[PDB]
Symmetry: C4
């Protein structure tokens, strides 16, 4: 459990040292691991692959209980739509200053905010926090990123690929409007 | 052998504890592992990948000897059709109350019952047990699940994906009628 | 090295015991491992992935030196055609009585004989040994297996998938005739 | 760290011995490992998979700082184009005499020179060193390799697949001209 973490990070330390990365850079990497993994590390994909559909769906719904509550997207949504969304989400942690999205680039994923603050820059800046999502526009229109999104504070986010976005909207077509009104 | 199981489950215990899952939930997970793996755990895909075609086909035919005997589907079927089916099946264990299939959703797999009882709900309920299969309709018509299937008792089932379903019917086209009459 | 083998086979022994396979069956599996791996076991794909193109190509050409010499297919062929073929081949070992190919089934691979004897049955039987290949017909015509091929003796064979077969013929189009005359 | 290397190479030694490779060949393999891995070995793909987008992009930009400086390709290029290119590059080491590219074959990748000298042979020979790239022609025209490229000295190169080449040019279409003028 905690042994896996310390061993994995030692390898990371050796990697950074082998490539002679700068001190401050190694400190940034260190902080990332602590914030992201919290001293413990699991082969989740492996543990979840041992379970069945129902169990996996129960675990995701529980782990994301807080996130689902903050999101109006699931305001009064179909519980199965919620599950279809959650099971396809990928947990990611961002650091202050990080460029989550860069304007003019091809977008292949959107983000759901669990906890943290991001600045949307296209024009003047704008703030988005817990509950809200961003990066859905290019997913609907297939165009380029309509803005850059720099991380303001430590951000605990859940991303969704364009493929998974579309696969979920293939099963719940009318839930597409929710994303459209936010972007329209 | 048994060491792999206990080690894998300890990681599972740590995972559940790390995510502060409720007690009763951890008990449900515990029961699943015992029913599904039975105290022993093997990297089957790995062991089978070391063998050859014939050996793998012999093992599947033997391991599923009981299942093949209960199924009328293989009533008087071509032994090679049986093998083509077995090699593509995925063993799964379900718990009482579990939703194996949910009505109105996109279906991507069907199920063959080795041992257990399921309730088919669309209308009044219906029971299906050893030997029978379910979830084939959307696989033939490509529509939505025509009913929900909640697990009544511990169910030891073998699933078949739509792709594998079609791949097998590409090699044994006339065996498609068997599935159709059950659903017609 | 040899430790990896003994450990891997112990897991295999536990697997067979867990599934209560018959004695004679466990003996057949045992003989397979000894003939196929010869007491030593390597993560080849892993070792080869650490090397570069040239090294990997040198190793395959050396390991298959004997096989290339027995094959008229490479009679006076382009050395690069030989390499293109070798790098895509998969080493397989078959036991006496084994059905390598079954008539009327969809074929997805052909075989090159390094050492051993096979019986081609469609009509009366026919024998093929070192140097010769079989199962190319359905690969050229895309039809069904034109015959069954039961292993007569321990067979050390190298298989080639239909995809790899075609990919190699895309780069060496005229080498297709060699396969055609054998099947014509 | 260094333990992983020595253990991995011992397996390599056993592999070479198991296949009775010649002495000089085993010496060539030995030299490759030392030049390529430098006594240390990391599961990079694994370490990088634990990080996030930004961190991974920072690491690649730093590790390839020297390579980016030697390349005119990035003369005054968009920093994001540089990143898009770097993240898709695969580090490879070649030995003196090695055939990196063979004339008349289907090309599926191009190469960027970090350090070393190659001979381009189609006609008389030609030398290319640090900063320059080669093998882009067939990537633009989809034809066959217009020349062979034998490694003159130890070459530390970064390859780019045709798919990744095109994916990067889909996001930075006008950067295609840079490759064209070099090949025109
Ligand atoms: Br946005
Ligand atoms: Br966007
Ligand atoms: Br913060
Ligand atoms: Br955080
Ligand atoms: Br809907
Ligand atoms: Br049904
Ligand atoms: Br259905
Ligand atoms: Br029960
Ligand atoms: Br059970
Ligand atoms: Br049929
Ligand atoms: Br034949
Ligand atoms: Br054939
Ligand atoms: Br024999
Ligand atoms: Br043998
Ligand atoms: Br040719
Ligand atoms: Br060139
Ligand atoms: Br070229
Ligand atoms: Br040199
Ligand atoms: Br070097
Ligand atoms: Br551009």
């Amino acid at each position: 459990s905690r042994r896996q973490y310390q061993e994995k990070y030692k390898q990371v330390e050796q990697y950074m040292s082998f490539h002679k990365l700068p001190a401050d850079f190694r400190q940034k990497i260190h902080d990332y691991y602590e914030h992201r993994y919290q001293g413990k590390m699991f082969d989740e994909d492996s543990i979840l692959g041992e379970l069945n559909g129902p169990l996996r769906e129960e675990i995701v719904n529980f782990n994301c209980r807080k996130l689902v509550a903050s999101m109006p997207l699931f305001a009064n949504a179909d519980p199965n739509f919620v599950t279809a969304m959650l099971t396809k989400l990928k947990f990611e942690v961002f650091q202050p200053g990080d460029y989550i999205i860069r304007e003019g680039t091809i977008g292949k994923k959107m983000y759901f905010i669990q906890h943290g603050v991001v600045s949307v820059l296209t024009n003047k800046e704008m703030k988005l926090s817990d509950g809200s999502y961003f990066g859905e526009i290019c997913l609907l229109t297939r165009g380029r990123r309509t803005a850059s999104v720099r991380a303001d504070t430590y951000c605990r986010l859940y991303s969704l690929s364009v493929d998974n976005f579309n696969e979920v909207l293939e099963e719940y077509p009318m839930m597409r409007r929710a994303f459209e009104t936010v972007a329209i």
